[PDB]
Amino acid sequence: QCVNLTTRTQLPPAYTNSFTRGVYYPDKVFRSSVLHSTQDLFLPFFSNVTWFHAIKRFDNPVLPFNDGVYFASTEKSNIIRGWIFGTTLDSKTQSLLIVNNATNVVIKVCEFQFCNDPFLGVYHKNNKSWMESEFRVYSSANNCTFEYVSQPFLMDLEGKQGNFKNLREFVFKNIDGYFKIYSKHTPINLVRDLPQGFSALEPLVDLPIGINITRFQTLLALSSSGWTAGAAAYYVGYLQPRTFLLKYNENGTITDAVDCALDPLSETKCTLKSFTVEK
Amino acid sequence: VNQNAQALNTLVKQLSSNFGAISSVLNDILARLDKVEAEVQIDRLITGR
Amino acid sequence: GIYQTSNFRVQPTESIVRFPNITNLCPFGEVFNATRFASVYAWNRKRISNCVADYSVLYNSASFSTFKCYGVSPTKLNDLCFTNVYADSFVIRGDEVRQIAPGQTGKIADYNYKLPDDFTGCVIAWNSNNLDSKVGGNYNYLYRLFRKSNLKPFERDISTEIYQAGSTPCNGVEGFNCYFPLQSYGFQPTYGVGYQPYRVVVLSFELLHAPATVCGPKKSTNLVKNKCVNFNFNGLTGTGVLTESNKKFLPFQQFGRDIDDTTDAVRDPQTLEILDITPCSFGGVSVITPGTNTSN
Numbered sequence: 008q009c010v011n012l013t014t015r016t017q018l019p020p021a022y023t024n025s026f027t028r029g030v031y032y033p034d035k036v037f038r039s040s041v042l043h044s045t046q047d048l049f050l051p052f053f054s055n056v057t058w059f060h061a062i063k064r065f066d067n068p069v070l071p072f073n074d075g076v077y078f079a080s081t082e083k084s085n086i087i088r089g090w091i092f093g094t095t096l097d098s099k100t101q102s103l104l105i106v107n108n109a110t111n112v113v114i115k116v117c118e119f120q121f122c123n124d125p126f127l128g129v130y131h132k133n134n135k136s137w138m139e140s141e142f143r144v145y146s147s148a149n150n151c152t153f154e155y156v157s158q159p160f161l162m163d164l165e166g167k168q169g170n171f172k173n174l175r176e177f178v179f180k181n182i183d184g185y186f187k188i189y190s191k192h193t194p195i196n197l198v199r200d201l202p203q204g205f206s207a208l209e210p211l212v213d214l215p216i217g218i219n220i221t222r223f224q225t226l227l228a229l230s231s232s233g234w235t236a237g238a239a240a241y242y243v244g245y246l247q248p249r250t251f252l253l254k255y256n257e258n259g260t261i262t263d264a265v266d267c268a269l270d271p272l273s274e275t276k277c278t279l280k281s282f283t284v285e286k
Numbered sequence: 287v288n289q290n291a292q293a294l295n296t297l298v299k300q301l302s303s304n305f306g307a308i309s310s311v312l313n314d315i316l317a318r319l320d321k322v323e324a325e326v327q328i329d330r331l332i333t334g335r
Numbered sequence: 336g337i338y339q340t341s342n343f344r345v346q347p348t349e350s351i352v353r354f355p356n357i358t359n360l361c362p363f364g365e366v367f368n369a370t371r372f373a374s375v376y377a378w379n380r381k382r383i384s385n386c387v388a389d390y391s392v393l394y395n396s397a398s399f400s401t402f403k404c405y406g407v408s409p410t411k412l413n414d415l416c417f418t419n420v421y422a423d424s425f426v427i428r429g430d431e432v433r434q435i436a437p438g439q440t441g442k443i444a445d446y447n448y449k450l451p452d453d454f455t456g457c458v459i460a461w462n463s464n465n466l467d468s469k470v471g472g473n474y475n476y477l478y479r480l481f482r483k484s485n486l487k488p489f490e491r492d493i494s495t496e497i498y499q500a501g502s503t504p505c506n507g508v509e510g511f512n513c514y515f516p517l518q519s520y521g522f523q524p525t526y527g528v529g530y531q532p533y534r535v536v537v538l539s540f541e542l543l544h545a546p547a548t549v550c551g552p553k554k555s556t557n558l559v560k561n562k563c564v565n566f567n568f569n570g571l572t573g574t575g576v577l578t579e580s581n582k583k584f585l586p587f588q589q590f591g592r593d594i595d596d597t598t599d600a601v602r603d604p605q606t607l608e609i610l611d612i613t614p615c616s617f618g619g620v621s622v623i624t625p626g627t628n629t630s631n
């Protein structure tokens with residue numbers, strides 16, 4: 008059950024600036040109205056971020072993985088349906104699969120004989136139905152290291168809203184053999200810009216996996232050459248170890264941050280443990 | 287006033303340093319090792335403080 | 336005048352041992368009695384979670400030969416709740432049973448299994464000559480005889496690549512300064528001490544990052560309030576008075592340090608209540624006296 012696919016508008020990468028995005032709670036313990044200073048993997052402020060589209064046009068290449076990655080994707084009808092993670096993706100090394108079924112996302116840590124151009128084949132059908140008979144993800148599952156089923160959330164899978172209300176963020180830290188997911192969603196009424204402003208990123212789940220990943224690719228619904236898919240975009244940022252000043256609020260939410268290596272002014276802010284400096 | 291309150295905070299945060307020990311809480315190391323082997327760890331904390 | 340002496344304190348009154356709810360026993364026994372034990376290069380891995388483990392059966396039993404705990408004391412090992420437990424199982428020759436120690440040198444301790452200096456777990460060894468020795472030789476077990484670069488702690492190496500002893504290219508299935516990475520253990524009953532096979536298991540663990548799940552005797556009592564008591568919510572012993580607080584934890588919050596390092600307001604097991612902690616009242620007594628020559 009593999010069908011190749013190159014019905015893409017081949018385009019070179021587009022770029023954008025990652026202003027103040029990618030701030031997640033470092034540890035589970037709680038603090039309030041204090042300025043803790045910690046160093047960890049993050050997405051450095053003001054960095055170039057790779058851009059791909061999705062509608063004609065079809066962006067789905069394979070991108071490398073290293074020291075985590077920050078995946079964000081604006082969406083209407085949230086065409087994105089899953090990811091893949093692995094070193095070889097040929098039923099040779101343990102591979103990670105996260106299939107978000109409308110019903111619920113099931114974590115399949117099993118070696119998988121993938122396709123050369125895999126994707127969720129959900130049938131282009133234009134009669135108020137999207138019946139799926141194209142399970143075009145893998146071919147063989149000889150052994151499963153792990154298996155899990157999440158909460159049965161049913162998120163909206165239709166719409167052509169003028170402003171992409173849905174804006175979902177994720178981040179995928181793979182350290183000490185544990186997999187981590189921190190996510191947040193916010194309705195947005197702007198049209199294009201990777202939003203300017205600040206937010207946080209709560210955790211959702213952590214997994215014991217103990218697998219070696221260097222490569223990954225997203226998965227999404229879709230006939231092969233022919234479909235009715237709305238506008239969709241997703242940016243990818245590569246993480247980096249840095250140090251931060253995190254200003255918790257009395258409520259307990261991470262309200263603002265300051266980098267410790269961006270520019271000398273920020274470095275003095277980092278040293279003095281204050282958000283303001285007198286002359 | 288700032289200088290005096292500067293000292294206490296620098297003094298208080300010193301209570302959260304390994305000083306070479308394997309932890310920074312006495313109740314922890316007391317409830318995590320037998321009697322004969324705790325003294326060597328506790329020594330490093332006392333001389334540090 | 337006035338003199339400052341012998342500061343006073345409130346005494347505590349009772350104890351609180353509220354642990355999380357009791358679940359089943361851990362299936363470690365079948366691990367420590369598995370049909371077969373994986374070889375050293377590809378040491379078997381087992382994860383322990385969602386069970387209650389009583390270490391008395393494992394410890395008091397003479398079923399073992401050599402026992403040693405490093406970061407903990409096995410006497411009170413049954414009173415600290417662990418976030419996770421690793422059950423690493425393999426069989427080696429009894430000669431190198433000292434190489435298991437963290438920061439040791441040796442062919443097994445350098446090439447195909449390494450430990451960190453701060454390995455917090457406990458290590459058990461148990462002689463296995465009768466069943467693991469084969470009258471013809473238990474050659475099922477191999478080992479990484481040579482490695483290009485000694486591996487970091489807890490990284491399994493599975494390649495069967497032919498060794499390169501020299502800079503000259505290695506060619507064919509075998510070649511000049513080419514050798515198989517693995518050499519088979521011989522295990523026969525004729526062997527003496529140190530030569531006979533051993534079943535060795537190590538039990539590392541990790542602390543406090545997430546609410547722990549493995550525990551021992553639970554004996555949760557109550558949530559008495561405004562009483563100087565000795566609380567032991569999960570293995571964080573401490574004293575003081577427990578009050579209700581209008582504070583709020585997000586669904587993934589306990590252990591509010593809340594200023595610098597103090598275990599301030601904390602949630603509880605058995606239920607979900609955001610409590611608070613304040614140490615019992617303290618102060619330094621002082622005696623004001625006229626001259627003892629005058630009056631007493």
Ligand SMILES: *[C@@H]1O[C@H](CO)[C@@H](O)[C@H](O)[C@H]1NC(C)=O
Binds near residue numbers: 022023024055
């Ligand atoms: C990064 O983006 C800027 C535009 O913001 C562009 O001028 C520059 O060439 C980009 N650099 C890279 C890494 O392509």
Ligand SMILES: *[C@@H]1O[C@H](CO)[C@@H](O)[C@H](O)[C@H]1NC(C)=O
Binds near residue numbers: 139
């Ligand atoms: C998810 O969707 C795929 C493709 O339709 C299907 O094979 C699989 O059984 C589904 N799993 C769940 C949890 O429904």
Ligand SMILES: *[C@@H]1O[C@H](CO)[C@@H](O)[C@H](O)[C@H]1NC(C)=O
Binds near residue numbers: 150
């Ligand atoms: C999958 O891996 C296991 C070892 O974990 C192995 O025994 C098995 O042969 C592999 N493939 C199959 C057929 O399940």
Ligand SMILES: *[C@@H]1O[C@H](CO)[C@@H](O)[C@H](O)[C@H]1NC(C)=O
Binds near residue numbers: 219220221
């Ligand atoms: C992961 O795989 C890569 C590519 O084969 C290898 O270079 C690296 O050493 C591996 N790392 C681990 C932790 O196994």
Ligand SMILES: *[C@@H]1O[C@H](CO)[C@@H](O)[C@H](O)[C@H]1NC(C)=O
Binds near residue numbers: 258260
């Ligand atoms: C913080 O808590 C107060 C009191 O409950 C509430 O009025 C306010 O809206 C909260 N703010 C945030 C950031 O949630």
Ligand SMILES: *[C@@H]1O[C@H](CO)[C@@H](O)[C@H](O)[C@H]1NC(C)=O
Binds near residue numbers: 356357
């Ligand atoms: C769980 O805890 C509650 C409150 O202590 C108790 O009433 C209940 O019986 C417990 N259930 C189990 C699984 O022991």
Ligand SMILES: *[C@@H]1O[C@H](CO)[C@@H](O)[C@H](O)[C@H]1NC(C)=O
Binds near residue numbers: 368393
């Ligand atoms: C294995 O089984 C025997 C049965 O007599 C028992 O004595 C021994 O303690 C068991 N070993 C372990 C710890 O699994």
Ligand SMILES: *[C@@H]1O[C@H](CO)[C@@H](O)[C@H](O)[C@H]1NC(C)=O
Binds near residue numbers: 626628630
């Ligand atoms: C006792 O000693 C005090 C000084 O402490 C002195 O003033 C006083 O005159 C002495 N005589 C008396 C009244 O006992």
